[PDB]
Amino acid sequence: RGSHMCDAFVGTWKLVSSENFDDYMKEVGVGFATRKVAGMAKPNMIISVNGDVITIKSESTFKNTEISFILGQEFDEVTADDRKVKSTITLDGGVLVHVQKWDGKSTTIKRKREDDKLVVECVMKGVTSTRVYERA
Ligand SMILES: O=C(O)CCCCNS(=O)(=O)c1ccc(Br)c2ccccc12
């Protein structure tokens, strides 16, 4: 295959800043101990594309996770904080939009390229967290 617009996400990324993530996790329903340990994590994210399949891997001292998916096609995800969710990821004008649904709740995670950074915006109801990754 030739290039895909999704190739702009491809690579190895490291978390350099996090804002409001504790309050985001609170809104999501994450328990005290998990929030404290998860909040300390400075994960590496490795994104790759192979045909129609996109893979996002996260490695940290908190948890190692991996999801593989096709855009617009719902899949089962066990999140880092051990929620069992139904996830659908789509592209909207260059932005990967990831919706997680569980227990009648919903949260949206947007991943976008901004300058040389990968910016992750997590929203749960009225609460937004911004996490910024740089190339590793
Ligand atoms: O990848 C990031 O740095 C942003 C976090 C994405 C949030 N959704 S998640 O289920 O993949 C997730 C990923 C990583 C951590 Br640490 C989480 C902690 C609490 C709740 C969710 C967490």
Curated annotation (Swiss-Prot):
Phosphoserine PTM sites in chain numbering: S17
UniProt subcellular location: Cytoplasm; Nucleus
GO molecular-function term, one example from the UniProt record: fatty acid binding
Cellular compartments per GO CC: cytoplasm; cytosol; extracellular exosome; lipid droplet; nucleus
GO biological process: brown fat cell differentiation; cellular response to lithium ion; cellular response to tumor necrosis factor; cholesterol homeostasis; fatty acid transport; long-chain fatty acid transport; negative regulation of DNA-templated transcription; positive regulation of cold-induced thermogenesis
Principal location listed in the UniProt entry: cytoplasm
Subunit structure: Monomer. Homodimer. Interacts with PPARG.
Free-text comment about domains: Forms a beta-barrel structure that accommodates hydrophobic ligands in its interior.
Designated name of the protein: Fatty acid-binding protein, adipocyte
Gene assigned in the entry: FABP4
